[PDB]
């Protein structure tokens, strides 16, 4: 009758399976810079924006014309193995990538068709820049908590190959302005890869990691979006951490890991300083994989798992700031 | 303890407000045909595919470069007035259109920023071809039923102006093949427009229309998709009507209206015949507005409302078949 923060938390929702795919091809920032050198020389700009402002030494790309749906499909096959269940158990499949095969049909339907989902499986895509995987986890959690389904897949395949190709094209053209070139460099911090998660009703999966849910705040006055964006982003995150205290009971020192969406080395450094977070609890892959958009969060969770970095009882914070602006923060208990 | 169909229905979810926008400009199929006449003459094709196979006399377009987000915003302002609430009450805003301003940020965030949502409002886009508005209604319903929010907006603005422009360009070119021209004609059954709905917890809105929820079936083996598509579509719909009997208790003769997504005159005629539905309970706008994608369903519901066509207690079926293939069917009680 009297509301409490903890009442909105999911009680009966778990993670049965989790997998990621690293894209295979390394492209170093040194190789990109050689290609860009004469637009750099031409513009009278002497700074290595990628290596030294962004802090990206390399990113991963696909070796071939891999569609979003292909990479999600591959990640989804692995997470099913990880969970030890067949595709027939899946009642819901949500695709959360920014990369998309077509405006029609949804990417989710293509992935589902690849996996051979049953006729009872509901499917759709969610789009919300870099926070969508956490939005799809939440969506599936509600259906699970209610009993509408027993098992869900949340998938995300990202591909940036064509982005890099169109981008390096404009940036190495005699024509190009500084204001333009500068906008374009940020496309070069993106990376490729994929992740998938099998979520389930906790009674069907006893002792699996528990998905508690989370909180979202927004600052859509700034949907227009530079130097400003870091500041507004931190201010939104401060307010989401308050919400997270009110619902999840978070204080920073009680969390065992922060799985953070990452934009750049300086953006991450500022976030971490501003909230007093110990950097040893912030696994980072941006410097060699780049920004994998909404897949980043689950990829980093899956890497933590693979390295045996997580223990029963570990409180794990999933968070990011995304375009909109939006900020979400959720908790897993391993 | 023993599951029953009715257990999955939402008990506490209502429609507080509903509005639509008709796009202003009429483009007749006769005017399009004059432009296409020499590709028709050239191809040795003597049939008016638009007027006589599709059954579309006209469609509506925007008079200017209206973005999806602009049309959703306008529809959303009207549905708030209809509901008599201010934007501060809104805890969730989902955008469901196929049309999209950018791959980033979500269209939802742009709409929310336009309306001036508060910092507590969660936002994201759902994409699922023509069924997404019903998917967004369901998503919001779950959050409402649980008490996470009190009010939600589900919005959808569609724009086809650029589709028509690129399409009529390829179709009137000496170059063009029949197989190509034939693919392209179907883009010419699309229309523009928008809709928005305010959903709320039923205790906050006593006596408003009730959203019970619904069912989905899929046939994602056919995500590859002609003449076949009508048949597979009917077969999927048959199976969804079974699910709807099992959950909602539907029989065809007990429903007062069918608000059906519409693809074409013959597609609709076949659906209606195959299920024995009385055509007088199928309001249709396709012949003068064309296919408004996922906005079609709410637009037709809103038109029914406006005409005073609905009575307290009326059982209203919302349905469509969408790419994937997917089929969903949900019930409103006015
Ligand atoms: C410290 C945070 C600053 C906010 C920056 C947000 C930029 C977001 C991006 O452009 C991508 O990484 C992901 C995204 N679009 O959500
Ligand atoms: C009788 C049904 C036949 C199935 C046809 C589906 C075509 C769907 C479309 O192409 C659009 O109208 C909407 C959509 N993509 O969902
Ligand atoms: Mn290689
Ligand atoms: Mn006009």
Swiss-Prot record, chains A, B:
Residues that hold Mn(2+) according to the record: 25, 63
A Pfam family reported for this protein in Swiss-Prot or TrEMBL: ACP_syn_III_C
Gene3D superfamilies, per the entry: 3.40.47.10
A single MF term (Gene Ontology): 3-oxoacyl-[acyl-carrier-protein] synthase activity
Disulfide pattern: none
EC number: 2.3.3.20
Catalytic activity: a 1,2-saturated acyl-CoA + an acyl-CoA + H2O = an (R)-2-alkyl-3-oxoalkanoate + 2 CoA + H(+)
Main location, first listed in the record: cytoplasm
GO CC annotation: cytoplasm
UniProt function note: Involved in olefin biosynthesis. Catalyzes a non-decarboxylative head-to-head Claisen condensation of two acyl-CoA molecules, generating an (R)-2-alkyl-3-oxoalkanoate. Is active with fatty acyl-CoA substrates that ranged from C(8) to C(16) in length, and is the most active with palmitoyl-CoA and myristoyl-CoA.
Family, similarity comment: Belongs to the thiolase-like superfamily. OleA family.
Cross-referenced NCBIfam families: PRK09258.1 (NF006720)
The protein's name: Acyl-CoA:acyl-CoA alkyltransferase
Originating organism: Xanthomonas campestris pv. campestris (strain ATCC 33913 / DSM 3586 / NCPPB 528 / LMG 568 / P 25)
Gene label: oleA
């Amino acid at each position: 009758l009297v509301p409490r923060g903890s009442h909105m938390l999911f009680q009966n929702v778990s993670i049965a399976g989790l997998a990621h795919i690293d894209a295979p091809h390394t492209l170093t920032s040194k190789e990109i810079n050689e290609r860009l050198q004469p637009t750099y020389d031409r513009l009278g700009i002497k700074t290595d924006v990628l290596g030294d402002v962004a802090g990206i030494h390399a990113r991963r790309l696909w070796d071939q014309d891999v569609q979003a749906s292909d990479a999600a499909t591959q990640a989804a096959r692995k997470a099913l193995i990880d969970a030890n269940i067949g595709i027939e158990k899946i009642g819901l499949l949500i695709n959360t990538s920014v990369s998309r095969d077509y405006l029609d049909p949804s990417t989710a339907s293509i992935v589902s068709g690849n996996l051979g989902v049953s006729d009872h499986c509901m499917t759709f895509d969610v789009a919300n820049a870099c926070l969508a995987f956490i939005n799809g986890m939440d969506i599936a959690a509600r259906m699970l908590e209610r009993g509408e389904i027993d098992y869900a897949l949340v998938v995300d395949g990202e591909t940036a190959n064509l982005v890099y190709e169109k981008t390096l094209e404009r940036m190495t053209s005699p024509d190009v302005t500084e204001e333009e070139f500068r906008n374009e460099l940020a496309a070069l911090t993106l990376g490729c890869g994929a992740a998938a998660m099998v979520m389930a009703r906790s009674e069907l999966v006893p002792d699996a990691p528990r998905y508690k849910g989370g909180v979202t705040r927004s600052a859509t006055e700034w949907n227009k979006l530079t130097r400003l964006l870091l500041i507004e982003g931190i201010k939104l995150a401060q307010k989401t951490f308050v919400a997270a205290k009110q619902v999840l009971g978070w204080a920073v020192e009680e969390l065992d890991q922060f799985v953070i969406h990452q934009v750049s080395r300086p953006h991450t450094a500022a976030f971490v300083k501003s909230f007093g977070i110990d950097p040893a609890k912030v696994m980072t892959i941006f410097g060699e994989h780049g920004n994998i958009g909404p897949a980043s969060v689950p990829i980093v969770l899956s890497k933590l798992k693979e390295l045996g970095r997580l223990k029963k009882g570990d409180r794990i914070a999933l968070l990011g700031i995304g375009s909109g602006l939006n900020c979400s923060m959720a908790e897993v208990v391993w």
